[PDB]
């Protein structure tokens, strides 16, 4: 028969792309603009996440003959700026944020406090319609949002990001990974993809893998989380 043991691409699990996006936008509009909101009830893990991200990223900034710069970073799917506040602003002179939910970007101005004065652009846009500026960012940080893009949109977005990188720049994807296949969450209207699917999409965007690391010390019940450094 035609029905496979499991799905391995978004076209197998997304019935209607327009509705996939509109339902996700509606979902996020209804979430409190708080760290626990950003983390789906896992606010208590935020420091574990941030401290691992810092160690992961610092190697590129501090080590080697071709160091990644610290001028400008872009936080993608940034929400209220949880990552911008604790990871990026302390490391980069300037940060831009892009998120589909305007109210989160508005809350960011409060949440980020005085250091938030160094957030330059707050872009209210879906990543699928966003073009980061060519030759603009040392680091493009994409966390806990790739499941909201279709395969074609994710591939193209990553390709646009590649063009946005300054010399020695990197893209980091940090996100949920499925054990096998592609799984639809029909509540928040997102997918979770396995490592092979994500690797295929990275390759299709013309990106090379620099590092790949599974996040330790996370809640036992949640999807595994991986960080990929790319350029």
């Amino acid at each position: 028969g035609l029905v496979p043991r499991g799905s391995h691409m978004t076209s197998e699990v997304i019935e209607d792309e327009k509705q996939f996006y509109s339902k996700a936008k509606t979902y996020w509009k209804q979430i409190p603009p708080t760290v626990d909101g950003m983390l789906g009830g896992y606010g208590h893990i935020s420091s574990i996440d941030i401290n691992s991200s810092r160690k992961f990223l610092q190697r590129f900034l501090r080590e080697g003959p071709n160091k990644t710069g610290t001028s400008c970073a872009l936080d993608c799917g940034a929400g209220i700026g949880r990552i911008t506040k604790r990871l990026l602003l302390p490391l980069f002179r300037e940060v831009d944020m892009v998120d589909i939910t305007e109210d989160f970007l508005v809350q960011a101005k409060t949440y980020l406090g005085e250091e938030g004065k160094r957030v330059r652009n707050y872009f209210c846009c879906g990543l699928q319609d966003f073009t980061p500026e060519p030759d603009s960012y040392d680091v493009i940080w994409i966390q806990w949002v790739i499941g909201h893009l279709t395969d074609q949109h994710l591939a193209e977005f990553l390709r646009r990001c590649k063009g946005s990188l300054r010399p020695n720049g990197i893209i980091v994807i940090k996100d949920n990974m499925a054990q096998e296949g592609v799984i639809l969450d029909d509540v928040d209207s997102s997918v979770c993809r396995d490592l092979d699917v994500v690797r295929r999409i990275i390759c299709s965007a013309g990106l090379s893998l620099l590092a790949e690391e599974r996040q330790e010390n996370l809640p036992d019940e949640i999807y595994h989380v991986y960080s990929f450094a790319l350029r």
């Binding site: 950003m38 893990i45 806990w144 949920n176 054990q179 799984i183 809640p219 949640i222 999807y223 989380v225």
Partner: peptide, 6 residues
Amino acid sequence: XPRRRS
């Protein structure tokens, strides 16, 4: 963000 495995 983090999500319980389905």
